[PDB]
PDB file of C-alpha atoms and ligand atoms in Angstrom:
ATOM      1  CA  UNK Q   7     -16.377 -15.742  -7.020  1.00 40.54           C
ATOM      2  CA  UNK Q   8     -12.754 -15.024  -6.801  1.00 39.61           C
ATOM      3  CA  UNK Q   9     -11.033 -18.088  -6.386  1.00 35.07           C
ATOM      4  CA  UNK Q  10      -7.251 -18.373  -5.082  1.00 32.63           C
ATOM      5  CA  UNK Q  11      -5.448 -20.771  -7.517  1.00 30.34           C
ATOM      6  CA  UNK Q  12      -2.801 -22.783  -5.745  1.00 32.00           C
ATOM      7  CA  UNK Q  13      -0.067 -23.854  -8.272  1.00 31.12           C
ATOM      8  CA  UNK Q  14       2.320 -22.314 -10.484  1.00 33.84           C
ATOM      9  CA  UNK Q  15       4.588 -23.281 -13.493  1.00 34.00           C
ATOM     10  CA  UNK Q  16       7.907 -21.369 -12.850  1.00 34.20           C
ATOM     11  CA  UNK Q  17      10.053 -21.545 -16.214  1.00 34.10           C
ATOM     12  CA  UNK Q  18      14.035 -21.767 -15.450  1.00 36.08           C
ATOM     13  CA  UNK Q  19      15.684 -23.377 -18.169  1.00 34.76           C
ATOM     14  CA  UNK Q  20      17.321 -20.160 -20.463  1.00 33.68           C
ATOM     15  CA  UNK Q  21      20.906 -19.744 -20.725  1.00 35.21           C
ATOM     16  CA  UNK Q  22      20.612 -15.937 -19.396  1.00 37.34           C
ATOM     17  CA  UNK Q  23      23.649 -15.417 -22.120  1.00 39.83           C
ATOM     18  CA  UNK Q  24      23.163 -11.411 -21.621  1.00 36.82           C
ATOM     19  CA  UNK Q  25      23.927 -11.980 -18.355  1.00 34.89           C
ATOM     20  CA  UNK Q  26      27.096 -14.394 -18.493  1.00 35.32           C
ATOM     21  CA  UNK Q  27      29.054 -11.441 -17.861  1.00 36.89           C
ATOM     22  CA  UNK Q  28      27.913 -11.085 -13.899  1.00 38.64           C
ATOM     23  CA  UNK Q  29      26.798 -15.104 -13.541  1.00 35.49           C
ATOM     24  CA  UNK Q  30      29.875 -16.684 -15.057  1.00 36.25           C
ATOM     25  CA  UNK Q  31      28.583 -20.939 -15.439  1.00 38.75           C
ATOM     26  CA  UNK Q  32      25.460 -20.483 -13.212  1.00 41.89           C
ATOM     27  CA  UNK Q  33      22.040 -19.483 -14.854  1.00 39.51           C
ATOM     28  CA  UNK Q  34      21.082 -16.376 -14.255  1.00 35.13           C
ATOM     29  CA  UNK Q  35      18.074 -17.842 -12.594  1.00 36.83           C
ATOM     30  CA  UNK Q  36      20.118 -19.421  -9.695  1.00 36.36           C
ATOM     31  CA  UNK Q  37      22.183 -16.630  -9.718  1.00 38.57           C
ATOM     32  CA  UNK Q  38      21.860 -14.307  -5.983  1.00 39.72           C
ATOM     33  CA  UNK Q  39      21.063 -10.778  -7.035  1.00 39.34           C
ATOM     34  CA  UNK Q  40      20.498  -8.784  -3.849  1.00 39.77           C
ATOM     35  CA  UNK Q  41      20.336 -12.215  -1.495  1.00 44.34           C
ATOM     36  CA  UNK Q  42      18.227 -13.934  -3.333  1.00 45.46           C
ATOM     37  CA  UNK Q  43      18.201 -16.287  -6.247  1.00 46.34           C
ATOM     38  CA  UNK Q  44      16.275 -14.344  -9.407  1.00 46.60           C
ATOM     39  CA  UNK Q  45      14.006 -17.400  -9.438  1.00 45.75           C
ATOM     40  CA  UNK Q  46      12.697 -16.648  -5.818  1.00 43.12           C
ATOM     41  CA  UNK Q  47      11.684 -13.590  -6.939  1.00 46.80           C
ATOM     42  CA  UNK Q  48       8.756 -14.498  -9.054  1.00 48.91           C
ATOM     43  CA  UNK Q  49       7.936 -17.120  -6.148  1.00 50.21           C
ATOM     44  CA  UNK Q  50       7.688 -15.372  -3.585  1.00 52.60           C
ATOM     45  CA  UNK Q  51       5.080 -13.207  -5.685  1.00 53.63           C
ATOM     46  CA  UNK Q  52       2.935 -15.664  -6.056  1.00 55.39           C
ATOM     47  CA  UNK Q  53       3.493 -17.893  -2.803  1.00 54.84           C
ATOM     48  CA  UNK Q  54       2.108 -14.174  -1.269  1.00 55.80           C
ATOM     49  CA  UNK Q  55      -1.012 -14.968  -3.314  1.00 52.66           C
ATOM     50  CA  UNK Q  56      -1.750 -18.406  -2.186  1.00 51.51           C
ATOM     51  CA  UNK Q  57       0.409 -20.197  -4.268  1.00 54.21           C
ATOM     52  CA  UNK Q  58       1.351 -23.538  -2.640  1.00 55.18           C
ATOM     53  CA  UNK Q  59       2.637 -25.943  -5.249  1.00 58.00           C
ATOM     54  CA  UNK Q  60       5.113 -24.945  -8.040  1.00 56.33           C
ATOM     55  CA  UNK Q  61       5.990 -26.827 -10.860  1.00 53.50           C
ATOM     56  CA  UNK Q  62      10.037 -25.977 -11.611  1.00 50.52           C
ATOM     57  CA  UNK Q  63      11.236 -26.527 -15.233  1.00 49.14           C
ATOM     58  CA  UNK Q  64      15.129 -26.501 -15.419  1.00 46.04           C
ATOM     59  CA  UNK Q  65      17.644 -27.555 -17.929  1.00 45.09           C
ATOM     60  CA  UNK Q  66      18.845 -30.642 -18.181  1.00 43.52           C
ATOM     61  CA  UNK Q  67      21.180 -31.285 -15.417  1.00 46.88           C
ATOM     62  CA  UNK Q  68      19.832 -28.711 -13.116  1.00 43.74           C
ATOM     63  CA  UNK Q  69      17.810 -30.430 -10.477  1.00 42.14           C
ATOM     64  CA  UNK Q  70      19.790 -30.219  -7.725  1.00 39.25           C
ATOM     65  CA  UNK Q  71      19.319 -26.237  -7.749  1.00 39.90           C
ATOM     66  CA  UNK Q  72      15.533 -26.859  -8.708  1.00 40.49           C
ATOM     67  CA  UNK Q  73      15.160 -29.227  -5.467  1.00 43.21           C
ATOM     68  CA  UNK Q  74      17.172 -26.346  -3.176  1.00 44.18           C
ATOM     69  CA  UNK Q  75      14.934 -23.545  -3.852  1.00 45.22           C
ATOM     70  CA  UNK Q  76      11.955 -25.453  -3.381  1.00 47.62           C
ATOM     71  CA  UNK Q  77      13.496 -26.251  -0.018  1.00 47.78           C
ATOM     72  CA  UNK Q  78      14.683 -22.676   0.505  1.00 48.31           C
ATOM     73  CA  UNK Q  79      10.806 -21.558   0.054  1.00 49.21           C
ATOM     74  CA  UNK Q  80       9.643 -24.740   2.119  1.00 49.40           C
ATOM     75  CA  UNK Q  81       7.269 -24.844  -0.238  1.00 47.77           C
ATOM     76  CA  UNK Q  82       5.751 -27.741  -2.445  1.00 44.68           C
ATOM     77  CA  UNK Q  83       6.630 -28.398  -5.966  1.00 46.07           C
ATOM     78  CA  UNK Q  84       8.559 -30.859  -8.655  1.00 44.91           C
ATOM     79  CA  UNK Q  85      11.519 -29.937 -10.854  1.00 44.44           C
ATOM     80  CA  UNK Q  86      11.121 -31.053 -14.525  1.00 43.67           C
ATOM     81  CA  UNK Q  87      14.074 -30.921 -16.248  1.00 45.09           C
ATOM     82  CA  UNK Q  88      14.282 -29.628 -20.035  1.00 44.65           C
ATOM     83  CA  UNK Q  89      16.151 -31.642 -22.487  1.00 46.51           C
ATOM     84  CA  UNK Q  90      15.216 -29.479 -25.388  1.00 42.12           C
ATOM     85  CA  UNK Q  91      16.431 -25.674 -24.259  1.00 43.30           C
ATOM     86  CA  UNK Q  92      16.624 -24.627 -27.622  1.00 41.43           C
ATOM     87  CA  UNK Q  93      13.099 -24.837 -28.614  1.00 46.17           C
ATOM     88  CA  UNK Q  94      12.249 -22.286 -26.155  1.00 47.31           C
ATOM     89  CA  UNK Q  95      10.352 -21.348 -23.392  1.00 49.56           C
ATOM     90  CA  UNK Q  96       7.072 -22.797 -25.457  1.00 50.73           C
ATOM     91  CA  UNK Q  97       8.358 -26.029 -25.012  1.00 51.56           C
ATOM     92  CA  UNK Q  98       9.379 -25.468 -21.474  1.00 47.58           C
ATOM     93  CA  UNK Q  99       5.877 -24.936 -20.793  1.00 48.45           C
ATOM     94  CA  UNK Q 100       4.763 -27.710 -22.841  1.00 45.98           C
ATOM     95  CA  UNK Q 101       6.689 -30.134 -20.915  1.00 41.63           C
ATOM     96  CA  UNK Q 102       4.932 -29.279 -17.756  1.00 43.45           C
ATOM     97  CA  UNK Q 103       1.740 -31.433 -18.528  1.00 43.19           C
ATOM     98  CA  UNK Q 104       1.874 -34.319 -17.004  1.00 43.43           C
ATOM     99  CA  UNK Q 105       2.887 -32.070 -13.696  1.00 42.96           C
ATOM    100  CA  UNK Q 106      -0.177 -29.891 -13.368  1.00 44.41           C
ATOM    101  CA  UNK Q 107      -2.604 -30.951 -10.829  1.00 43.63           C
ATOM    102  CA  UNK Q 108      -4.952 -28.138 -11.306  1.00 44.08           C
ATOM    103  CA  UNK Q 109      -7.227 -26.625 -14.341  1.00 43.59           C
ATOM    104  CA  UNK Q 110      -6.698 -22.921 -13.860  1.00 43.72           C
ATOM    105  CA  UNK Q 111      -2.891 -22.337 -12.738  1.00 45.74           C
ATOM    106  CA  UNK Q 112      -0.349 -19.295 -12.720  1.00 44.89           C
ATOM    107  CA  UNK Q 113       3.040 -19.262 -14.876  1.00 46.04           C
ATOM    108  CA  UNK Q 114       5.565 -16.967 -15.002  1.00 45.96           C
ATOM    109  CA  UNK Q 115       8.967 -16.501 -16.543  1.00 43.29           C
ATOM    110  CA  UNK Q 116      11.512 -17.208 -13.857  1.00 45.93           C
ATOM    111  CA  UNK Q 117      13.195 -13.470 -14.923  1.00 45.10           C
ATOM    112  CA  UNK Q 118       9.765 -11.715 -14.209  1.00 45.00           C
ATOM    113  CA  UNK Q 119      10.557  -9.550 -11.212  1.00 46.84           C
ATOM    114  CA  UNK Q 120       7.252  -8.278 -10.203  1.00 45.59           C
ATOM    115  CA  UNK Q 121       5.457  -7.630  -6.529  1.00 47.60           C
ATOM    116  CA  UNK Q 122       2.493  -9.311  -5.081  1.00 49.09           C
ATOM    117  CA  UNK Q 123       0.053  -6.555  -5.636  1.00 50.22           C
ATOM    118  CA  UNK Q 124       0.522  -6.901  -8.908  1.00 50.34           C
ATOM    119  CA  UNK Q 125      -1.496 -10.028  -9.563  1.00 49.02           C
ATOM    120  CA  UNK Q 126      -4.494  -8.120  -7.503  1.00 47.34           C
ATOM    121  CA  UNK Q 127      -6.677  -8.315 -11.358  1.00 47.98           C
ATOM    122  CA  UNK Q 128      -5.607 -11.528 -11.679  1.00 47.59           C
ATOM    123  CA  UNK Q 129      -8.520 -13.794  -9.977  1.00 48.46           C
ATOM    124  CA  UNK Q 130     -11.718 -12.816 -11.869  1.00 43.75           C
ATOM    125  CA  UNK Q 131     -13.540 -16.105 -12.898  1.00 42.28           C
ATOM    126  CA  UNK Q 132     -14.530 -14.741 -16.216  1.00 43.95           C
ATOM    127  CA  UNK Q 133     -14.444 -16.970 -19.107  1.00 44.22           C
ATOM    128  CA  UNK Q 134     -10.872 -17.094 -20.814  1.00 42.04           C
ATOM    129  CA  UNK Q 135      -8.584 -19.909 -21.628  1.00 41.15           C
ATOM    130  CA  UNK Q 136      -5.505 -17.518 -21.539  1.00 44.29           C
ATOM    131  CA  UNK Q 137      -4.967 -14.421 -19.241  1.00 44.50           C
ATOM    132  CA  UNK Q 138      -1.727 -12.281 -19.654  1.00 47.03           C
ATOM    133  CA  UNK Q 139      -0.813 -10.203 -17.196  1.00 48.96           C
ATOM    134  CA  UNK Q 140      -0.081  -6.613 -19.088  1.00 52.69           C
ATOM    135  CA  UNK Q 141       1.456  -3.521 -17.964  1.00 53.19           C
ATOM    136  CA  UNK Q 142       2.208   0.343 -19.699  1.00 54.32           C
ATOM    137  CA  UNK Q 143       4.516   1.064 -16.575  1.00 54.63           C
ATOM    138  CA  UNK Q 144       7.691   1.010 -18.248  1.00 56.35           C
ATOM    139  CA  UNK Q 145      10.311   2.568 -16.450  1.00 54.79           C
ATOM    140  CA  UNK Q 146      12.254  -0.432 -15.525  1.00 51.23           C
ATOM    141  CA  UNK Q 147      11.823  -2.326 -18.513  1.00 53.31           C
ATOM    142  CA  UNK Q 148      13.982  -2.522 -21.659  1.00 57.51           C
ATOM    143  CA  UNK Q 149      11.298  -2.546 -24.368  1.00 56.20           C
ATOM    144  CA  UNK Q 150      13.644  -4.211 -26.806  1.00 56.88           C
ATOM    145  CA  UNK Q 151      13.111  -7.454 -24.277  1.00 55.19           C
ATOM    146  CA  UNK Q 152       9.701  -7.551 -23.675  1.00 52.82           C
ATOM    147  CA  UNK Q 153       6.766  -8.651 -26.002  1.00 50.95           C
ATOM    148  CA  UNK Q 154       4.480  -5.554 -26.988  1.00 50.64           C
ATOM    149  CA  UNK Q 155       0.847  -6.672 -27.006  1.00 51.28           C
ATOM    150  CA  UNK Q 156      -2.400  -4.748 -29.061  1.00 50.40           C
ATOM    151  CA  UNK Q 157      -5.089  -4.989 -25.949  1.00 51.70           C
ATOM    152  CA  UNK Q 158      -8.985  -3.660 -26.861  1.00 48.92           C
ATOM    153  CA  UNK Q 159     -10.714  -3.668 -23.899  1.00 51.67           C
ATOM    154  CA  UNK Q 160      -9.616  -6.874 -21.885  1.00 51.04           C
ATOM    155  CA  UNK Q 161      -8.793  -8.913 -25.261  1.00 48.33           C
ATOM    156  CA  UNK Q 162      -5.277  -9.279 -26.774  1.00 47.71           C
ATOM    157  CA  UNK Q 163      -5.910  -8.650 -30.432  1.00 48.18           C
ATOM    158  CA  UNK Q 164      -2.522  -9.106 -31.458  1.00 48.77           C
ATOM    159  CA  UNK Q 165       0.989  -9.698 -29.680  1.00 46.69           C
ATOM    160  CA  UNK Q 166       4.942 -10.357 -31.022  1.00 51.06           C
ATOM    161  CA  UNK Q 167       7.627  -8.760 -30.885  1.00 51.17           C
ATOM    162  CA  UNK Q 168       7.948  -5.973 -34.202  1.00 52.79           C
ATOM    163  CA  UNK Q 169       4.022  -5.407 -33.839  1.00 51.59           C
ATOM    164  CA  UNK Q 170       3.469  -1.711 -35.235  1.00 52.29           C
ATOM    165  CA  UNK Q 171       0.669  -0.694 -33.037  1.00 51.59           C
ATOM    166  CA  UNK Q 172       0.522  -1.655 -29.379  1.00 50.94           C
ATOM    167  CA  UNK Q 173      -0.724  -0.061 -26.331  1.00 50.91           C
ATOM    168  CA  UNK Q 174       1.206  -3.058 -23.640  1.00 47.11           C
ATOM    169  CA  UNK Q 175       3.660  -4.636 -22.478  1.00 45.95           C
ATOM    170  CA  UNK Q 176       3.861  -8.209 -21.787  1.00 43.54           C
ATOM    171  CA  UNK Q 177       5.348  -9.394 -18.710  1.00 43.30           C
ATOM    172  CA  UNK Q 178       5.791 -12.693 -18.732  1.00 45.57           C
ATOM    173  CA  UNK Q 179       2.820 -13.488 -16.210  1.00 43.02           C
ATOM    174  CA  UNK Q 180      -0.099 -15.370 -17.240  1.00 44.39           C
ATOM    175  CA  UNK Q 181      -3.138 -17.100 -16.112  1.00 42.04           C
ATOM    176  CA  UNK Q 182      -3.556 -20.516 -18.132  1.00 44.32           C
ATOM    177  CA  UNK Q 183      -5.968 -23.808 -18.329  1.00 43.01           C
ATOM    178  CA  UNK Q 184      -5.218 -27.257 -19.407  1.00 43.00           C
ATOM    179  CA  UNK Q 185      -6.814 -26.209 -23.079  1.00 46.01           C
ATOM    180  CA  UNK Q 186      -3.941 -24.385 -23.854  1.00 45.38           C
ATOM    181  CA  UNK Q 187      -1.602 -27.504 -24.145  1.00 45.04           C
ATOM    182  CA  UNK Q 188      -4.168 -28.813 -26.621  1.00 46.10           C
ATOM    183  CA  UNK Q 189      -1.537 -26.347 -28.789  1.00 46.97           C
ATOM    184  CA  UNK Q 190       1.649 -28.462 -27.983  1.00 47.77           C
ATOM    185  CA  UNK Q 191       0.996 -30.217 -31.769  1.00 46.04           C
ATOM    186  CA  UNK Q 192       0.411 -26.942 -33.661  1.00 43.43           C
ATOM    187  CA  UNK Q 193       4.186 -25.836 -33.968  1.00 43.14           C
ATOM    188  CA  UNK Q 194       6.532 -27.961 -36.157  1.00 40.52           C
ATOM    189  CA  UNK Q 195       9.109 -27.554 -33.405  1.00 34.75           C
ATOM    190  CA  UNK Q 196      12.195 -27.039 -35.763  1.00 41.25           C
ATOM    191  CA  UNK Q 197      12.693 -23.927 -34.339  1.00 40.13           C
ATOM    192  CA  UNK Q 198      12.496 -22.007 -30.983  1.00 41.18           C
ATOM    193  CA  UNK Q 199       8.770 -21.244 -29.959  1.00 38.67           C
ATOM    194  CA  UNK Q 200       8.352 -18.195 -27.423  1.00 40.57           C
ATOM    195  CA  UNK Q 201       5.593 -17.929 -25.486  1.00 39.90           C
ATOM    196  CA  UNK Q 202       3.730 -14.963 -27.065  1.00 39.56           C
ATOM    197  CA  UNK Q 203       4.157 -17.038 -30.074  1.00 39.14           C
ATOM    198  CA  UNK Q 204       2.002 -19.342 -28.197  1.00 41.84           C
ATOM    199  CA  UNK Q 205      -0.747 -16.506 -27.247  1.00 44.83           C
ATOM    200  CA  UNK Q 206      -0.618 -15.439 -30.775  1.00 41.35           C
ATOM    201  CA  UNK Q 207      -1.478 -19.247 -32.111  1.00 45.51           C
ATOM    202  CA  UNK Q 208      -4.307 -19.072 -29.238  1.00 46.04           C
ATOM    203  CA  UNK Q 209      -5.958 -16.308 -30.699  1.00 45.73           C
ATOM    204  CA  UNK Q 210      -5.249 -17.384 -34.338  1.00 46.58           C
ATOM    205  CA  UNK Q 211      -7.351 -20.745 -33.622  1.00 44.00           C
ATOM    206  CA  UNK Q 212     -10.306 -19.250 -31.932  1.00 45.49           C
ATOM    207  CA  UNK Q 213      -9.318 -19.510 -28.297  1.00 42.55           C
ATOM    208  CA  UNK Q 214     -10.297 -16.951 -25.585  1.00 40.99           C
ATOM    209  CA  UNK Q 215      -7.172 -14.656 -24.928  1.00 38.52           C
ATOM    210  CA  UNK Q 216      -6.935 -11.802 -22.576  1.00 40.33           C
ATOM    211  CA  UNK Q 217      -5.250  -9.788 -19.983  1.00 35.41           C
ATOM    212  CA  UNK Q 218      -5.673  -8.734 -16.583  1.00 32.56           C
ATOM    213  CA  UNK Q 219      -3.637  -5.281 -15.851  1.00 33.43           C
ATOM    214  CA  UNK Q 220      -0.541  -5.038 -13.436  1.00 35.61           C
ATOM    215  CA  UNK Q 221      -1.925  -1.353 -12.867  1.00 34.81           C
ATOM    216  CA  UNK Q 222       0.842   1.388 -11.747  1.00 35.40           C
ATOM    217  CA  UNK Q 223       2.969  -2.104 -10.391  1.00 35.59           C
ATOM    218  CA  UNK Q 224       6.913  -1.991 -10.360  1.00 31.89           C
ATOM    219  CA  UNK Q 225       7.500  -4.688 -12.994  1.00 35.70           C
ATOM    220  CA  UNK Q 226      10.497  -5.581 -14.995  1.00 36.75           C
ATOM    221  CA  UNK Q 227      12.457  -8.848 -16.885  1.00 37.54           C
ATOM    222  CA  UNK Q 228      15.869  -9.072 -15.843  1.00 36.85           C
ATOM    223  CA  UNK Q 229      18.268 -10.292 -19.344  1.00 37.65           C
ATOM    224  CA  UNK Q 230      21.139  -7.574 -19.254  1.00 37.73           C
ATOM    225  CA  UNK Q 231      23.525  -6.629 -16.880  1.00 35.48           C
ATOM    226  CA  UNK Q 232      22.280  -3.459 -17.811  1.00 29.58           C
ATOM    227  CA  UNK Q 233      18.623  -4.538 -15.870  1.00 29.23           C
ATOM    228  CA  UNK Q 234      20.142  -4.487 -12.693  1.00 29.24           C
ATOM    229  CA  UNK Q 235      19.972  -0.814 -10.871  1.00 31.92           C
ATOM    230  CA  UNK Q 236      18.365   0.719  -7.854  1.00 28.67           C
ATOM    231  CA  UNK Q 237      15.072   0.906  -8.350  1.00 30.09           C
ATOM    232  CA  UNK Q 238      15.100  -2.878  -9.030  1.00 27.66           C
ATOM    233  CA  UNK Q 239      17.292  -3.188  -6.169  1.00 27.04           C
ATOM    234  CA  UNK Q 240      14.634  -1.392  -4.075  1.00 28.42           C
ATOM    235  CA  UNK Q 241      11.505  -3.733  -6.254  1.00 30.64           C
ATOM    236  CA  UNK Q 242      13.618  -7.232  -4.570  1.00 32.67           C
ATOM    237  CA  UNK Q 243      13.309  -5.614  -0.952  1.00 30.64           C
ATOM    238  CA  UNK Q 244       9.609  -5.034  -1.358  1.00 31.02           C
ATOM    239  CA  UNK Q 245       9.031  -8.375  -2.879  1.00 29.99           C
ATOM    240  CA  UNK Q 246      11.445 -10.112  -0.247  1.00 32.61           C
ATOM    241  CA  UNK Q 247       9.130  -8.425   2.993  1.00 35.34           C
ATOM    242  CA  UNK Q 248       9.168 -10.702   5.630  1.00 38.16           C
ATOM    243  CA  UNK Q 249      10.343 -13.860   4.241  1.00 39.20           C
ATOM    244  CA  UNK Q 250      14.183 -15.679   4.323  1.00 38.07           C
ATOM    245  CA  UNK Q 251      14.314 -16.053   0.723  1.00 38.99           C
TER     246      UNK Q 251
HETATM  247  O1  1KH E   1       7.156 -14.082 -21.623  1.00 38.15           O
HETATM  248 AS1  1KH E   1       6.805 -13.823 -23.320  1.00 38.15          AS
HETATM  249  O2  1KH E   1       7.347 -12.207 -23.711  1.00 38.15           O
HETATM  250  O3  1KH E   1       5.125 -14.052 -23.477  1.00 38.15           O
HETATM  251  C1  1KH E   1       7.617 -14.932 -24.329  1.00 38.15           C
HETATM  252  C2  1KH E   1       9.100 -15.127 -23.983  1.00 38.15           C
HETATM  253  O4  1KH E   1       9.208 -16.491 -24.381  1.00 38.15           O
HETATM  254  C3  1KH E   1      10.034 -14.468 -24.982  1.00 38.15           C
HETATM  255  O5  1KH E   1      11.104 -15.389 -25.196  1.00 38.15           O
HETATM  256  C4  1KH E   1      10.784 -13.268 -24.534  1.00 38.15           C
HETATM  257  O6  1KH E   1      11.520 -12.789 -25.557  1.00 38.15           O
HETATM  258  C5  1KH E   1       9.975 -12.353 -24.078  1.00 38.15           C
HETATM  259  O7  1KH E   1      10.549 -11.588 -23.269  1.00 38.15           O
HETATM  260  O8  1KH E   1       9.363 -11.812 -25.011  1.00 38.15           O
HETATM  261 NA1   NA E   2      13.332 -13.639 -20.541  1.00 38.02          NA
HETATM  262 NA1   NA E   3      -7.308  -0.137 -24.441  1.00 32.23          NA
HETATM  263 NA1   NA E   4      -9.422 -26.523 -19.892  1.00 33.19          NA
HETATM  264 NA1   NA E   5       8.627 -16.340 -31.576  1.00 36.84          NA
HETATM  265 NA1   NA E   6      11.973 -14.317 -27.565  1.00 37.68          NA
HETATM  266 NA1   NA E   7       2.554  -2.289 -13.867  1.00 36.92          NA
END
């Protein structure tokens, strides 16, 4: 009973102001970095693990470059645009509701750079209504960017930012189900919401939270200029194996 699920939310509506530096106007996520757009990165991932349908959220007035890497891909999907970038990638996901055609669905940042193998943990049908994907390989990362999550056994326990005792990363991957927009009306949305603020609120309200392991994967979330060296370099050939991106 491992079943293949065959959609994804992709979120690609940030800025990338870090990055302004190498992508000038475009956002980082349409931006080519080693032939590629970053976006197709993540895609590609999961397309290599059966996904077939993607649901794209962009910022308003970015649908044309939405539509092109669906194309690209010739894969399946709708772009959503985001009118609303600065409440954060919360309400990115938020907005992608209506979209989902599935109960059990993949979503990833569109900055996670991460290779196929490393969603192997990822189809158990054990009883969650959030699954993180985790990691401790840190190498690539820059731990200032990523979330740091408290994990006991395969539960997150805790997860932000400036949490004091933590034995993960988060990576931006994650398993969800259609409960976890039931959270949509629990923020006052004055603010920017994250996602891990989201996970946090999940396991503040009784929901089932928890992780499935990336193991010894190449992982990393590309913000900085700084991001961008060989061994990544070397992470967007293995992910790009035998497809045109
Ligand atoms: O992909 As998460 O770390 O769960 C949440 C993401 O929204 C957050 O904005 C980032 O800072 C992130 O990298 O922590
Ligand atoms: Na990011
Ligand atoms: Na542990
Ligand atoms: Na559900
Ligand atoms: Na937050
Ligand atoms: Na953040
Ligand atoms: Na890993």
């Amino acid at each position: 009973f491992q079943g293949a699920m065959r959609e994804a939310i992709v979120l690609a509506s940030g800025a990338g102001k870090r990055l302004r530096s190498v992508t000038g106007d475009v956002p980082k996520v349409f931006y080519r970095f080693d032939g590629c757009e970053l976006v197709k990165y993540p895609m590609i991932s999961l397309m290599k693990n059966g996904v077939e349908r993607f649901v794209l959220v962009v910022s308003e007035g970015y649908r044309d470059l939405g539509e092109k890497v669906l194309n690209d891909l010739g894969v399946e999907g709708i772009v959503v645009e985001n009118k609303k970038v600065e409440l954060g990638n919360a309400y990115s996901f938020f907005l992608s509701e209506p979209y989902v055609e599935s109960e059990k669905f993949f979503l990833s940042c569109g900055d996670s750079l991460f290779p196929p193998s490393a969603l192997k943990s990822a189809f158990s049908e054990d009883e969650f209504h959030i699954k993180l994907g985790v990691s401790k390989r840190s190498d690539l990362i820059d731990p200032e960017k990523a979330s740091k999550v408290l994990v006991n056994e395969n539960r997150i326990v805790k997860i932000g930012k400036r949490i004091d005792q933590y034995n993960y990363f988060d990576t931006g991957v994650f398993v969800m189900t259609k409960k976890v927009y039931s959270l949509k009306e629990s923020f006052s949305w004055t603010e920017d919401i994250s996602l891990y603020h989201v996970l946090q609120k999940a396991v503040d309200t009784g929901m089932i939270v928890k992780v499935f392991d990336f193991g010894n994967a190449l992982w990393t979330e590309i913000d900085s200029p700084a991001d961008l060296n060989s061994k990544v370099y070397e992470l967007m050939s293995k992910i790009k194996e035998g497809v045109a991106c």
